[PDB]
Write a protein that binds this ligand. Sequence first.
Ligand SMILES: Nc1ccn([C@@H]2O[C@H](COP(=O)(O)O)[C@@H](O)[C@H]2O)c(=O)n1
Ligand SMILES: Nc1ccn([C@@H]2O[C@H](COP(=O)(O)O)[C@@H](O)[C@H]2O)c(=O)n1
Lengths: 228, 228
Amino acid sequence: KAKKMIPIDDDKLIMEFKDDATAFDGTKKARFKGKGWLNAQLSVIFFKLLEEHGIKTHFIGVAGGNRLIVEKLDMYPLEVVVRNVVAGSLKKRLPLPEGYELPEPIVELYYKNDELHDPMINYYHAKVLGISLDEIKKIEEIALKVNEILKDYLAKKGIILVDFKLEFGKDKNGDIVLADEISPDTCRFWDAKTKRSLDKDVFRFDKGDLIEAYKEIYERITGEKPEF
Amino acid sequence: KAKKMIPIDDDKLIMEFKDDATAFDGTKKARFKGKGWLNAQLSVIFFKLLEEHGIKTHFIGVAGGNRLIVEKLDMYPLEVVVRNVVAGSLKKRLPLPEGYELPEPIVELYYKNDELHDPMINYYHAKVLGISLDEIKKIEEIALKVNEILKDYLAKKGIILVDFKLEFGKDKNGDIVLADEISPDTCRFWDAKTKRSLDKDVFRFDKGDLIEAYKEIYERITGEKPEF
Ligand SMILES: Nc1ccn([C@@H]2O[C@H](COP(=O)(O)O)[C@@H](O)[C@H]2O)c(=O)n1
Ligand SMILES: Nc1ccn([C@@H]2O[C@H](COP(=O)(O)O)[C@@H](O)[C@H]2O)c(=O)n1
């Protein structure tokens, strides 16, 4: 959809961010010039923040342009979703309005499977998929810690971390390592004052110009205007 | 759909089993003469078996015909599903065939909510709904024990307990008590030899005559032909 993966060797690979955007199970599609760059840069900033906080990520370095060098891992077939504020699919699962502030974070597990359109699963389904209760517990522990770090950091910049999606794999030591990306593609970010979307929802629901929203996040996070 | 509830006082009520059957979010409907009687009788047999095994149920007694006297409870808004063999909706959640024998039982939680069409939930959604992790753990512990007792009992009668749904509430002591019904409406039952459905799937998928299938379960469980 929005990224490619180039092998280097056993230890590492390239993760390239493309300008393509898709939504609604890729039934909606557009290209946004500079999106790749924005999403690459923001992933790096977030990975570096998490690393300083003692979160193990796959981030190794940058390879110019929209390319990151990342650790190769045995990927878990999961999308791990952490939610602070009601939005998106949660409205179809709990009878609560968009914008409802949750009493505590919700963690949701989704089975990465295109044939089944990524259905939500629980710990028992995960076990049948070969993922132990210990592993699931470690995964959710990390996700919730990531949540705390990102939401605090972003709030001190005028942004509500509404929800976000993470992916994980295992390294050669058997350690659980945070993978994939962290960007306005994979998070919901709302302005603290106006509650307006500064993320992929701008594209999903035609709420304005996506590049404009993604630049605004970047500027608010870095304090600099996007170079490209 | 298939049952009514008549108040008696604070302590108890009547649960009446009707001949109505519905499926596919009540878009399919029929009436089966004697179904109420069968489902009433079988619920009683199962509740009595579980009670002997130290499971707390709402079963108090029989009130003639298709009526049970049951303890009044503060109902949890849950449908608790235990699965031993792949069937039904599980095929849309895990890429496994109908009839796959699971390595261990799966427990699934569904939020009872007609507006949302009973969506599956996890422990975090349950907490937002006011159900503590301790309560959810006690509920699943009971469900899995119920599974062991029923599947053993039924296997010693030539029936595979494929999956089933339970409901629970709290009594005045704050204890978690098994409620609603246990019947061929709320379980999948397969013949051990032929793998054929002796349950509501006969109605769901026009696999034969429902009353015939429900009688066969009853006869195999009791050793007697249904009196009515
Ligand atoms: N495949 C997916 C599914 C959800 N997500 C993200 O997870 C969060 C939850 O999305 P839903 O409300 O669609 O479940 C959103 O921030 C969304 O962008 C994602 O980045 N990739
Ligand atoms: N509302 C519901 C949903 C499921 N069930 C039962 O739970 C089991 C799982 O059903 P699904 O495969 O439809 O999830 C089946 O035995 C079905 O009869 C029920 O008795 N009432």
